[PDB]
Amino acid sequence: NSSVLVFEISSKMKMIEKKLEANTVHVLRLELDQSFILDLTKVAAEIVDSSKYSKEDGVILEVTVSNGRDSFLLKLPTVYPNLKLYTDGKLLNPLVEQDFGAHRKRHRIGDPHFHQNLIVTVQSRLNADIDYRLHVTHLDRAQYDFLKFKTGQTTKTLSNQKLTFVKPIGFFLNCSEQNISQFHVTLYSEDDICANLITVPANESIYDRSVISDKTHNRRVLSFTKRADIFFTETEISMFKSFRIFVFIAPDDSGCSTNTSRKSFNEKKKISFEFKKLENQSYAVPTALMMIFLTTPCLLFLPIVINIIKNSSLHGQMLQYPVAIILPVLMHTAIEFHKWTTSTMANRDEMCFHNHACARPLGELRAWNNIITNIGYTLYGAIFIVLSICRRGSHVFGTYECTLLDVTIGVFMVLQSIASATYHICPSDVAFQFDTPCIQVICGLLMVRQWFVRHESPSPAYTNILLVGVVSLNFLISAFSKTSYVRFIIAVIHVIVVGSICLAKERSLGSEKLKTRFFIMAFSMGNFAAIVMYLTLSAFHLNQIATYCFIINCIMYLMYYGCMKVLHSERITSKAKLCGALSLLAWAVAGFFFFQDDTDWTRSAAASRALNKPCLLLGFFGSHDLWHIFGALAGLFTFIFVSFVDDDLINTRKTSINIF
Amino acid sequence: NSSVLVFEISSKMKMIEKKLEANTVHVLRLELDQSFILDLTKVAAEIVDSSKYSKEDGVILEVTVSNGRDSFLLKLPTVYPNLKLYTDGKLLNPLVEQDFGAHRKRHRIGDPHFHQNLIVTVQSRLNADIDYRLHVTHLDRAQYDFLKFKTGQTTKTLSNQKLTFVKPIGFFLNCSEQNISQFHVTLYSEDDICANLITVPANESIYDRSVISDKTHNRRVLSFTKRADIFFTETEISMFKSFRIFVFIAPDDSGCSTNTSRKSFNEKKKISFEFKKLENQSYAVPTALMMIFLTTPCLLFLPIVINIIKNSSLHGQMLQYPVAIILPVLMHTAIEFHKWTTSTMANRDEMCFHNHACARPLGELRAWNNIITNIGYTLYGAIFIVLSICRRGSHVFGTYECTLLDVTIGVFMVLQSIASATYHICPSDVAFQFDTPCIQVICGLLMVRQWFVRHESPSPAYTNILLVGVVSLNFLISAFSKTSYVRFIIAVIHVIVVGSICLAKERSLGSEKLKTRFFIMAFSMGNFAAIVMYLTLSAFHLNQIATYCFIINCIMYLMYYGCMKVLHSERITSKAKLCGALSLLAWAVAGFFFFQDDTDWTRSAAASRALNKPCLLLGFFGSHDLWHIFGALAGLFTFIFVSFVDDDLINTRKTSINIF
RNA sequence: GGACGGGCUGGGAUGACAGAAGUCGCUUGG
RNA sequence: CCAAGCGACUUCUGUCAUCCCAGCCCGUCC
RNA sequence: GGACGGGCUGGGAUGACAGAAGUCGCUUGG
RNA sequence: CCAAGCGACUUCUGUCAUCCCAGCCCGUCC
Ligand SMILES: CCCCCCCC/C=C\CCCCCCCC(=O)O[C@@H](COC(=O)CCCCCCCCCCCCCCC)COP(=O)([O-])OCC[N+](C)(C)C
Ligand SMILES: CCCCCCCC/C=C\CCCCCCCC(=O)O[C@@H](COC(=O)CCCCCCCCCCCCCCC)COP(=O)([O-])OCC[N+](C)(C)C
Ligand SMILES: CC(C)CCC[C@@H](C)[C@H]1CC[C@H]2[C@@H]3CC=C4C[C@@H](O)CC[C@]4(C)[C@H]3CC[C@]12C
Ligand SMILES: CC(C)CCC[C@@H](C)[C@H]1CC[C@H]2[C@@H]3CC=C4C[C@@H](O)CC[C@]4(C)[C@H]3CC[C@]12C
Ligand SMILES: CC(C)CCC[C@@H](C)[C@H]1CC[C@H]2[C@@H]3CC=C4C[C@@H](O)CC[C@]4(C)[C@H]3CC[C@]12C
Ligand SMILES: CC(C)CCC[C@@H](C)[C@H]1CC[C@H]2[C@@H]3CC=C4C[C@@H](O)CC[C@]4(C)[C@H]3CC[C@]12C
Ligand SMILES: CC(C)CCC[C@@H](C)[C@H]1CC[C@H]2[C@@H]3CC=C4C[C@@H](O)CC[C@]4(C)[C@H]3CC[C@]12C
Ligand SMILES: CC(C)CCC[C@@H](C)[C@H]1CC[C@H]2[C@@H]3CC=C4C[C@@H](O)CC[C@]4(C)[C@H]3CC[C@]12C
Ligand SMILES: CC(C)CCC[C@@H](C)[C@H]1CC[C@H]2[C@@H]3CC=C4C[C@@H](O)CC[C@]4(C)[C@H]3CC[C@]12C
Ligand SMILES: CC(C)CCC[C@@H](C)[C@H]1CC[C@H]2[C@@H]3CC=C4C[C@@H](O)CC[C@]4(C)[C@H]3CC[C@]12C
Ligand SMILES: [Zn+2]
Ligand SMILES: [Zn+2]
C-alpha cells in the first residue's frame, strides 16, 4: 500500500460517503472546466457516528479544500462555547475568467486546453477507521456576482433566500466597474435566528489571519436577527474598490439573545436584501425649514429686551465665575472624537448603533440629521448669553438681577448642543452617556434662579454642586444598568434629594400653613407618584428617568412660583402667561417625542440593530430629531418666562417685595 | 495522466526542488514514526525565478501542510505593506505520545503498528510550469518542551538562539503539570531587528481565525527589538492552564522603527530567554520603610498647629465651594478603570507599557510599587484638609486666613494621588495623560495664596480658571505631540501667560522701582531661560515641560515673597527658614528623579518596550517611585512654609501690614 | 511466573540546538 | 572583475532529549 | 479575406436560485 | 407505537446567468 488514495469525483456528485482507514489519506479531485467561472463553491465535512468519539479531545478529522486560487481548512469537531458540532463548511473564492486562458472563442484546436482542479484532502490522527460525509455544492454566477446595475438603476432587491449552517451565501461587489461612490446594504428577516453579516475587501480572506502580526481591522462582523445595515463610504470605496459580502448562520443563539431554545443547530433563515447606490446630498430643504421654524420663536425677544437695550469690577467676576463646569463635556467630546478618528471603516459599522431607518448620511457621518438637529440649543444658548450680558444695567426697586446665572444657563444650552452632537457620531455603551444631562442641569439652574430671586442674586456655585450631583447620578445609573436593583438605588437617591429640598424650604421660609405646608405636600406627592411610575411600569427606560424627574420638578416649581405670585395679590402679565403656556406645551411635546426613544444597552447587539423606526417628516426628521428641536424650544420658552414673569414688580420697592 | 502526482519523501530530505507542470497537483508524503513525538516541524515554500511573475496579481502558488493533528496553508506571494516576498513558512503543532498507541514497550509483535503521515500539497492557478522549493526542518523535543522545572528550581535560562523568516522558534508550557501559579518570561536581544512574540493557549491556533465570528482576544502579539516581557497571572493560568510561546521575525522593520535599512528580509537575530516561576508576595519591608520615611516628616506639624488646636454660616460656604474641580480626575479614573476591566488578559500585555526592569506585581497589577508609592500624597492631603478645618478660628491683627484655599490644596493632593495611581494601572497613549497636572494645580494654588494673602482671603475660583488652563494645556500638548511645532505652541502660550502675570502685578502693585520692576525682570529672565532650555535641548521630554515650568514659577514666586519679607524689615522665624530649605532640597531631589523618566509616546511600541531601568532601592523603588515620594515631601514642606512664614505678623495690626 | 516501576553499567539508532572547516541562489554599485 | 546577508551537508567539541534495549541483584503481588 | 464587435432568429449542454410531489440520518418524551 | 427541524434526486412552473453556436444581411480595415 501507499497510505495515499486518490479518488476522481464527478461534478454531479453532491454527497460523498467514504471510510478513512487508520493512518491513510484520501485525496479527492474534481476537474473544473470553464463552466465553473464565478461559481461560489461550498464544501462541508461531517463525521458519521460522532458518539464514538466523545472521549477524544482535540481535532479528530482534518479536511483541506483548494481550487488553486483559494483554499481553506476544516477541523472537526468545531468547538463553540455552548456546543460541539461534528460538521462544518466553508466557502471558496470562485475562479475568474482569466483562469481559463485568453479568448476561449474560435477553438480552431490550436493551443493546449487548460483546466482547473478542486482538491480535497482528508486526514486523521486516530488509529481507527472513521466514516465521514462530504457535501460539495455550488452557487452559480447568477446569484454570486448579482450586483450589476443597469443605466438609471440605483436599487436592486433580492428576496427569501434559504440559509443554513451548511448553505452560506455570498456576493461580489465591484465598485470600480459599476461606478459606485457610495453603497448601502440592508438585510430583512422575519425570524429571530442568529446570523452574521461579513464584509471584506476582495483581496482579503475571511478565514485566514494572513500575517502573524496583522492587527488590521477591515473585516465587518455584524450579528443580526431581524435587520442589519452596512454603509460603504467614499473613503472606503477609494481605499479598497472591491468587496465580498457573506452571511453565515451562528450555531447557537448566544450572541443574539439569551432564551430562544431553537433546538437543532441547523435551521433555515429567510433573508431579503437591498442594494442601493448613493450620492452626496445637501439636505437644503429640511435644514432650511428647520432653521425657519427655529427662528420665528425668537420674535418674542425682539419687542421687549432688545428694545430696552436700544433705549439704554468685571474682572472681579470673570476670574471668579466657575469655568470648570464646561470641563466634563469638553473631555467627553475629546475622548469620543479620538475614539472615532482612530477607528477603522469596518469597526464603525460594528461599534456604533444608529436608527438606520431614519439615518441620513453626510460623508462618514451615518446620521447627519441627529447631529444637525442640535443647532437650536446652540442658537438659543448664544442668544441667552448675549441678551443677558447686554441687558445688564437700579438696586432699590424690583427683583434682584440674575445676569451670571442666565449666562450659565446659556452656556449649558450650548454645552448640551455640543454633547448631543458628539453623542450621535457613534452611540454606544460607554461609561458616560452624556446625551441629556445638560438638560437636567438647565432645569436645576432654573429652579435655583426661582429659589433665590427674591432674596439675593443667584450664584453659580449652586451650578458646581448641581453638576457634581448630575454627573455622579449619570455614572451611577450607567454602572449599575446590568443589575436588577438600579431603579431602587435611583428611588432612594430621589427620595433623599426631595426630602433635602423640602427641609431646606421649611428652614428658609418657616412653618407657615399656606406657603410651606402645601409646597411640601405637592412636591412629595408628585415625586412619589413619579417614583411609583418608574418603579413598576417597565415602560420607562433607564436613560430617561433622570431627565424626566428633573423636567417634572422644574415644571412643578415654576407652577408653584406662578401660583404664589397669583395668590399674593400680584399680577402676571398676559405676555408672561403666553410664555408659560408655550413652555408647558413645548415640554409636553418634547416629552412625548422623548418617550419614543427605546434605547437599552443591556440587550444584545442584534436586538439593538433590530430597531426600525422610520422618519416622520420629509424623510429627514424622526422622533429623536423632533425631541431635540422641541427640547430646545421648551428651554427657550422657559427662559423667556422666568425672565419676564416678575415684570410687574419693576417699580416695587425691594423692602415691600414679598418673599416666597 | 491523472493530474495528481504522489511523491514519497524521506525524513533525511530537508530541501525539495520540483517543477509543477501546468494544471497538475503534487502530493508529498513523509511517514512519521515514534521519533517525531513533540518535534516542532517547520515547512517553508519558495518560488524559483520570481521575476517571471511580476505581472501576475493574487496568489501564484498554494501549499497545504498537515500532520493529522494540525494543519496550515501557505499562499505565495505574501503581501506586506512595504514588500512582497515569494517565500513563507509556518509552524505545525507537534504530535504527542498518545498519537502512537498505548505502552509502546514490549513490542512482542502482537497488535498492529501505527504511524503518522506528514502531507504536503502544492497547487497553482497558472497555466504554466512553476519551479518551487520546499524546506522541511524540525525542532526536537529538547528545545520545544524545554520548560520543565526540577525541585527548588524557579528560573531557567536559554541563550543565543538564531532566528529567521525561515526558522521560527516555539515552546510548550504546561502549568498544570509543573505546578505553576504565576509565570514570567523575558527576552533579551542586542540587535535591533524587528521580531514578534506570540502567546496562545495550547488548544488555540495562531494562524486560523477558528470561527467566523470570534472577537475573542487570547493571542498576544508583542513587537520587540531589544526586550519583551509577558506575565501569566493566576487568573489566566486558571482559565487556560497550558500555553504555547512563539517568536517570529518581521520581514520589514516598519512596526519597530522608521529608518534602519536592514536590506535583506532574511536576517538572523540572537535572543536569550528567561523563564521564572512567581508566587504571591506581600512587600512588607519596603512598604513599612516607605511609610516610616513618610511619617517622620509630619513631626513638624505636631509641636505648633496641633498644640494651638489643643489650646483652643458654614452652609453658606459648602454650597458655594467649587466641587466641580474634582470632576476631571474622577471621570478619567472611571474611564481608565472601565478600559482596564473590559480588557482581556492577552490585551493587557499589549496595550500597557511599564518599566518591567522595575515592576513588582500584585495580582493582576503589573507595577504595584508605582501605585503604592502615591500614598504620601493621600496622607499629606488628608492632613492638610483636617489641619486647615481644625485650625480655623481675629480679624484686626495678622494676615488674612486662607482656610478654603488650603482645603483646596489638600483636595488636589488627594486627587494627584488618585490620578497617578490610576495612570500606573496601564500607562498608554491616551487623550489625557493626567500623570502630573494636579502638581501644576498645587503650584498655581500656592502662587495664588501668596499673591492674595495680604489683601484679602484667597478664593477658590482662581482654582476654576487655573484648572481649566491646566487641562487645556495638557490636552493641547497631547494632541500635537506627533508634530514638530508643539514646543513652539508651548513657548507662545508660556510667554503669553508670563506677560499676563507681569502685567497683573504691575497693575495691582503699581510702578515702584524696587518692588515691581525687579519682580518683572527676574520673572521674565527665568521664564525666558526655561523656554530657551526646552526649545533647543531635546533632553526635556514633552510630558515634563509643563510640570517643570509650574514648579519653577512657584519656587521663584515663593523666593520673591521671602525676599520681600526680609527687605521690608520683617523677621522670618528659623522654623520657617528650615521649612523653606527643606522645601528647596526636596524639590531639587524630586526634579532630579523626575528627569530620569524618559517617556515618549511618539516612538514605536518596540522602542518603548526596550526600556531597562532597574530598581534603585530594595529591588522595589525605582526613579519614578522616588519621584512620587519626594514630590509628596516637597509639597508637604512647601505647604508648611507658606503656613508658617507670616507667623511674625500675628500681632501686627492689619492696617500696618505691608502689601507686596 | 506478572510487574513496571529500581539505581547501576555499557552499547545502539539517532534528532535538534549553541561554538569552529568550502559550496549554491538572490542583491546591488562601479 | 568586489563585498555582504541567507540557504544546503561534507565533520569537529561541549550538550540537551528520545527510544532499542544488556545483565545480575535488592524485591513484593501471581 | 480579418474582424469581434451587430440585432434578429432558433437549437443545444446545462448551472444555480425562489414556489409545488416521497426517501435517509440525527433528536428527544411517553 | 408520535411529531419536528435538516440533508439527498425522482419532476413541475416563473426565472436569473453561462458558453456551443445556426444563417443571411447592413458593414468598414485586409
Ligand atoms: C451619588 C449619586 C448622585 C446623588 C445626587 C443625584 C441628584 C443630583 C441633583 C441635585 C443635587 C443638588 C440639589 C440641591 C441640594 C440641596 C440644597 C438645598 O436644598 O438647599 C438649597 C436650596 O436650593 C434649592 O433647593 C434650589 C433648587 C435645587 C435644584 C436642583 C434639584 C433638582 C431636583 C431633582 C429631582 C430628583 C433628582 C432625580 C432623581 C432620579 C440652599 O439652601 P438654603 O438654606 O435655602 O440656602 C442658605 C442661605 N439662605 C438660608 C440665606 C437662603
Ligand atoms: C489653551 C491652552 C491652555 C492655555 C493656558 C495654559 C496655562 C494655564 C495656567 C494658568 C492660567 C491661570 C493663570 C492666571 C491668569 C492670569 C491672572 C492674573 O494675572 O491676574 C490675577 C493675578 O493672580 C495671579 O497671578 C496668581 C498666581 C497665578 C498662578 C498660576 C500661574 C502659573 C504660572 C505658570 C507658568 C507658565 C505655564 C507653563 C507653560 C509651559 C488676579 O488679577 P488682579 O488684578 O491681581 O486681581 C484683581 C483684584 N485686585 C486688583 C483687587 C487684587
Ligand atoms: C448658522 C445656522 C444657519 C446653522 C448652520 C447651517 C449651515 C452652516 C450648515 C447646515 C447644512 C450644512 C451643509 C450640509 C451639506 C453640505 C454638502 C457637503 O459638501 C458637505 C458640506 C455642506 C455644504 C454643509 C455645509 C454647512 C451647512 C450649510
Ligand atoms: C435664519 C432664518 C431667518 C432663515 C433660514 C436660513 C436658511 C434658509 C439657510 C441658512 C443657511 C443655508 C444653507 C447655507 C449653504 C448651503 C450649502 C449649499 O450647497 C446648499 C444650500 C445650503 C445647505 C443652505 C440651505 C439653506 C440655509 C439652511
Ligand atoms: C412651567 C411654567 C413655565 C408654567 C407657569 C404658568 C403660569 C402662568 C400658570 C400655571 C399654573 C397657573 C395657575 C393654576 C391654578 C390657578 C388657580 C385658579 O385660582 C386660577 C389661577 C391659578 C393660580 C393659575 C394662574 C396661572 C398659572 C400660575
Ligand atoms: C409637562 C411634561 C414635560 C410632563 C408630562 C409629559 C406628558 C405630556 C407625556 C409623558 C408621558 C406621555 C405618555 C406616555 C405613554 C403614552 C401611551 C402611548 O400611546 C404613547 C403616547 C402616550 C399617551 C404619552 C402622551 C404624552 C405623555 C403623557
Ligand atoms: C494606611 C497606610 C498605612 C497605607 C495603607 C497600607 C496598607 C493598607 C496596604 C499596603 C500594602 C498592602 C498589602 C500588599 C499585599 C497584600 C498581599 C495580598 O493578599 C493582597 C493584599 C495585601 C494583604 C495588601 C493589603 C493592603 C496593604 C497592607
Ligand atoms: C505609620 C508609621 C508610624 C508606622 C509604619 C507602618 C508600617 C510599619 C505598617 C502599616 C501597615 C502595615 C501593613 C499592614 C498589613 C499587612 C498585611 C500582611 O499580610 C503583611 C504585612 C502588611 C503588608 C503590613 C506591613 C507593615 C505596615 C505597612
Ligand atoms: C521656595 C521657598 C519654600 C523658599 C523660601 C526660602 C526663604 C526662607 C529664603 C530663600 C531665598 C532667601 C533670600 C536669598 C537672598 C538674600 C539676600 C541677602 O541679603 C541674604 C538674605 C536673603 C534676602 C535671603 C533670605 C531667605 C530667603 C528668602
Ligand atoms: C528647584 C528645582 C525644582 C528646580 C531645578 C531642578 C534641578 C535641581 C534639577 C533639574 C535639572 C537637573 C539636571 C539635569 C541634567 C543632569 C545631567 C545628568 O548627569 C543627570 C543629572 C543632572 C546634573 C541634573 C541634576 C539636577 C537638576 C539640575
Ligand atoms: Zn440625542
Ligand atoms: Zn507617576
Author numbering:
A (entry chain B), B (entry chain A): 32 to 343, 425 to 505, 510 to 776
What does the study report here?
In this study, we report the cryo-EM structures of full-length cSID1 alone and in complex with a 50-base pairs (bp) dsRNA, revealing the mechanism of dsRNA recognition by cSID1. Each cSID1 protomer can bind to one dsRNA molecule, which is located at the interface between BRD1 and BRD2. The dsRNA molecule is mainly anchored by the BRD1 and the BRD2 acts as a scaffold placed below the dsRNA, stabilizing the interactions between dsRNA and BRD1. With the exception of the 5′-end of the forward chain, where the dsRNA molecule tilts at an angle of approximately 15° off the membrane plane, the dsRNA molecule is nearly parallel to the membrane plane. The recognition of dsRNA by ECD is mainly mediated by extensive ionic interactions between the phosphate backbone of dsRNA and the basic residues of ECD. Intriguingly, Q65, D171, Q174, Q192 and N297 can form hydrogen bonds with the 2′-hydroxyl group of dsRNA. The electrostatic potential surface shows there are three positively charged regions in the ECD, matching perfectly with three major grooves of the dsRNA molecule. No interactions between bases of dsRNA and residues of cSID1 was found, reflecting the sequence-independent binding properties of cSID1. The loop 9–10 in the first binding interface of BRD1 is resolved in the map of cSID1-dsRNA, indicating this region is stabilized by binding of dsRNA. Notably, D70 in the loop 3–4 of BRD1 and D171 in the loopBRD1-BRD2 underwent a significant conformational change in the structure of cSID1-dsRNA, coordinating a putative positively charged ion in cooperation with S66.
